[PDB]
Design a protein around this ligand. Structure first.
Ligand code: ADP
Ligand code: ADP
Ligand code: ADP
Lengths: 735, 239
């Protein structure tokens, strides 16, 4: 038994002496809330930390940060021994000194700038011989214990004096640098990063297991994403956290060699990593190495591609090397590389969402000190087209602005800077706004994927439609047991038709938010570009991106916008079928029905929609969104007024009754006009900060009905023709 | 404190001995409109100029032209020391001669063509050892002081006689050529040029600051524009 062995895993808190344990873990080992333990690992070394309460990690695993993982020489997946230590122990004299690998540039006091704001009111239990890292001064510097009283009996106390000599010492090869790349340095990638964690955990941490079994290990991992997403960061972090010898192979570095030298350089890079097993061979750019799809210009290019292909599939076990290649675009790769044995496991790393970029900002700003009025929530929202490298550049530029506001008048003309100035240099929002306005996003044209923040509370009315949407996309994904028993497959998608500006997009986004799945949206111009550009082959890429991002919903806005541009029911001498809808149907028919992917079709002119899409099998479920009723319009305003401060004066119920033929869009622009009037009257009166009732009274003058009465009749007759519930309404069984 | 340190910046006027200062800058240092100062920089050298009134530059910076920046061996972003000099000082005999790097092609009188239309009705305070540049004759030729009365006490006066030998002298590597490319030689580019000024001011003027910090410096700047816009001019001027 020996219930003291726990699985080491990454922590969540950014502190130093923190251990995250579940309630039953301390309840089994008679451990309390505010106690200390003694973690013991390999190489005859121990560590003293503080246990904390957790409820998310696991049942029998320990969450330990990178700062303390390097102290015990224990990586992820290894096992350690934990035991309580209720013995009283105080600190008297702690002597520490940093290592010269990171102190080059520090001048002045070292206690007041790094130790005082870290050791006081913390009661961090230090251990003689441990390496702890502290952050501050827009950098990261650690410290090393060289001589102290024999451990245990080392706990920082307010009445403990600290003195240091001043010169640093050199480190050894036993410990790794804390400034390197780790799992805690990656943000905005959780679904993709977890797959890579679980994919290479066995062959790297346990190389001897695969040598004794017939299981084929994954020999190739291809990474996607626009340049700057962080593929190299993830590749280096996996190697640095799994104990594998990382070997970086740059793209242009090999191609820059002469004729025949590139072959030797690429070939010598494989057995070198094979000897240092386990190892990970990473390729920076692979589209620039093997673009053997359309280029095929030059014998040396083909020779390099063939050499790479030969060295790729020729890894018949031997070592335990895993090759992870990175590229920019999936189609820009040689198809011969995707053969089974060279590159079979495929990983697509997308642009982080709003909740992902905040983690990147927290990672990139953890070394510097910010002011109280600095919030990263608005920065992530305002930066919705940027990538991982974009935000690091934004942070660097924002940090540079603060230096410019103090270097000019202080004029520290010294060979090295002091640590007592940079700590006080707090970056404010004004520094970030200057850099945000000039940073050009590198990721704007390709489709962005989210899991939208809009929920059911933002949608007013449409209660009949909500239950229907929560009936076909949430039941097969949560309770499939009642589906395979009947032997019938679920629906492939549902089409939305009705008057424009009623919520055709809000329902699709809310159903994605509730189901916790990705959301891909295609607008009208996006569909029209591939028609006018005479290139309909881009549907396959959209469907592939949706498939491997499962679960996800495939939303097509105004699907009839391609038939409206060429007439409609009659139009020109052609019919109601074109190349883009052709390719969409072709890719939907061959789409995997067992996957969690879903397709949402939105249209405002259902009379011109091709019937070929509407058969049972592609899009059979049709839900009509009518104009909001009296109590449906009230909820629209109750949901739209949650952002702007409006007092109790404005009567929303009375406004809904007068707005009879008003769609959802008109009620939004009414509030927009009222708030614009409020802003204008505030600015004009500045030469008050609340929305009054006469604002809406004047804004109601220009209340234009976007939907007239002529199309209402057409929509209603179309709905009743497609429903056809008459005749069989009184159909009953005799006995 | 020591309120005598000012930030050196480019000037606006195309004159020679002109210092642009704000009203509070002279109001703090008890300096008037028509007075002279003594600018001191690095390498144990000084410079005498005339302060002027300005209202646009800054609160605590000094605007100094390229002609006087090379005299003190001070570039943009550096700091200097300014102090008033109300002592009376007149000129008696100023001996100057140009450098052969730019005089190849000049023949005849040198005073009437370059010094007379520059020194008269100007009262420019010269300093022994300074290199001042004058424009004229569809070119630019400067002059060098080789031997004169020990500075101070060098101010051009109408009753001051000037004679010159005629042969020039060679320059050294301490000073830079005034015919080179500078910030004053770029025109029509203010928004773009300011971004490049502020982008590389830190890593170039203070190389040791980035070596002691984790901030990533900009390693690459791409320039656009149709051929002939002046990208090479800006690139050479920044360096
Ligand atoms: N998801 C991320 N989390 C944290 N940092 C990131 C992320 N993505 C990129 N970065 C930062 O951007 C910098 C540049 O990354 P880069 O080498 O361009 O990645 P790639 O090689 O995948 O394009 C790195 O130093 C890294 O710190
Ligand atoms: N039922 C509704 N409840 C609340 N707001 C709505 C509703 N329908 C539309 N809106 C608002 O109208 C705006 C535009 O909607 P739009 O995308 O044109 O709808 P559709 O896709 O049905 O045409 C959205 O920002 C949304 O906030
Ligand atoms: N904005 C400018 N201000 C002053 N001179 C300019 C400017 N742009 C170009 N010139 C002049 O034009 C000449 C040729 O410039 P050129 O070398 O063609 O620039 P680039 O290499 O950027 O095309 C230079 O000698 C320079 O003096």
């Amino acid at each position: 038994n020996r219930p003291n062995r726990l699985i080491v895993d990454e922590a969540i808190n950014e502190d130093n002496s923190v251990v995250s344990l579940s309630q039953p873990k301390m309840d089994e080992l008679q451990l309390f809330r505010g106690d200390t333990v003694l973690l013991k690992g390999k190489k005859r070394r121990e560590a003293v930390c503080i246990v904390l309460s957790d409820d998310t990690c696991s049942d029998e695993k320990i969450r330990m940060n990178r700062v303390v993982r390097n102290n015990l020489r224990v990586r992820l997946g290894d096992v350690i021994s934990i035991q309580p230590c209720p013995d009283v122990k105080y600190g008297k004299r702690i002597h520490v000194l940093p290592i010269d690998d990171t102190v080059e540039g520090i001048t002045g006091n070292l206690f007041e700038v790094y130790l005082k704001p870290y050791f006081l009111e913390a009661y961090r239990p230090i251990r003689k011989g441990d390496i702890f890292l502290v952050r501050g001064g827009m950098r990261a510097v650690e410290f090393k214990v060289v001589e102290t009283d024999p451990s245990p009996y080392c706990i920082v106390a307010p009445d403990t004096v600290i003195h240091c000599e001043g010169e640093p010492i050199k480190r050894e090869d036993e410990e790794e640098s804390l400034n390197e790349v780790g799992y805690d340095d990656i943000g905005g990638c959780r679904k993709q990063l977890a797959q890579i964690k679980e994919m290479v955990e066995l062959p790297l941490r346990h190389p001897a297991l695969f040598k004794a079994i017939g299981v084929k290990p994954p020999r190739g991992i291809l990474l996607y994403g626009p340049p700057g997403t962080g593929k190299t960061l993830i590749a280096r972090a996996v190697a640095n956290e799994t104990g594998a010898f990382f070997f970086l192979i740059n793209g242009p570095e090999i191609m820059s060699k002469l004729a025949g030298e590139s072959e030797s350089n690429l070939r010598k890079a494989f057995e070198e990593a094979e000897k240092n097993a386990p190892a990970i061979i990473f390729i920076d750019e692979l589209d620039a190495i093997a673009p053997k799809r359309e280029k095929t210009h030059g014998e040396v290019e083909r020779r390099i591609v063939s050499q790479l292909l030969t060295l790729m599939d020729g890894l018949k076990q031997r070592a335990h090397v895993i090759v992870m290649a990175a590229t920019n675009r999936p189609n820009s790769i040689d198809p011969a590389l995707r053969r089974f044995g060279r590159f079979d496991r495929e990983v697509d790393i997308g642009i982080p969402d709003a909740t992902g970029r905040l983690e990147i900002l927290q990672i990139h700003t953890k070394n510097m000190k910010l002011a109280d009025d600095v919030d990263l929530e608005q920065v992530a929202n305002e930066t919705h087209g940027h990538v991982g490298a974009d935000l690091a550049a934004l942070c660097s530029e924002a940090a540079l602005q603060a230096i410019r506001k103090k270097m000019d008048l202080i004029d520290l003309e010294d060979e090295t800077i002091d640590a007592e100035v940079m700590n006080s240099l707090a970056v404010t929002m004004d520094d970030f706004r200057w850099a945000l306005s000039q940073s050009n996003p590198s990721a704007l044209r390709e489709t962005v994927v989210e899991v939208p923040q809009v929920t059911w509370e933002d949608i007013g009315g449409l209660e009949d439609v909500k239950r229907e949407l929560q009936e076909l996309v949430q039941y097969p994904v949560e309770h499939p047991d009642k589906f395979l028993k009947f032997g019938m497959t679920p629906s492939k998608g549902v089409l939305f038709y009705g008057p424009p500006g009623c919520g055709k997009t809000l329902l699709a986004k809310a159903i994605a938010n509730e189901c916790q799945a990705n959301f891909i949206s295609i607008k009208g111009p996006e569909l029209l570009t591939m028609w006018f550009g005479e290139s309909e082959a881009n549907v396959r890429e959209i469907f592939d991106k949706a498939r491997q991002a499962a679960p996800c919903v495939l939303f097509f806005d105004e699907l009839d916008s391609i038939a409206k541009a060429r007439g409609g029911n009659i139009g020109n001498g052609g019919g109601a079928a074109d190349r883009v809808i052709n390719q969409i149907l072709t890719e939907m028919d061959g789409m995997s029905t067992k996957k969690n992917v879903f397709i949402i079709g939105a249209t405002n002119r259902p009379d011109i929609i091709d019937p070929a899409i509407l058969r049972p099998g592609r899009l059979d479920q049709l839900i009509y969104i009518p104009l909001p009723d009296e109590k449906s319009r009230v909820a629209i305003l109750k949901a739209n007024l949650r952002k702007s401060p409006v007092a109790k004066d404005v009567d929303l119920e009375f406004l809904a009754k007068m707005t009879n033929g008003f769609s959802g869009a008109d009620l939004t622009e009414i509030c927009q006009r009222a708030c614009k009037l409020a802003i204008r009257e505030s600015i004009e009166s500045e030469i008050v900060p609340e929305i009054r009732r006469d604002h809406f009274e004047e804004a109601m003058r220009f209340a234009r009905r976007s939907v007239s009465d002529n199309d209402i009749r057409k929509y209603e007759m179309f709905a009743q023709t497609l429903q056809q519930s008459r005749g069989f309404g009184s159909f009953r069984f005799p006995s």
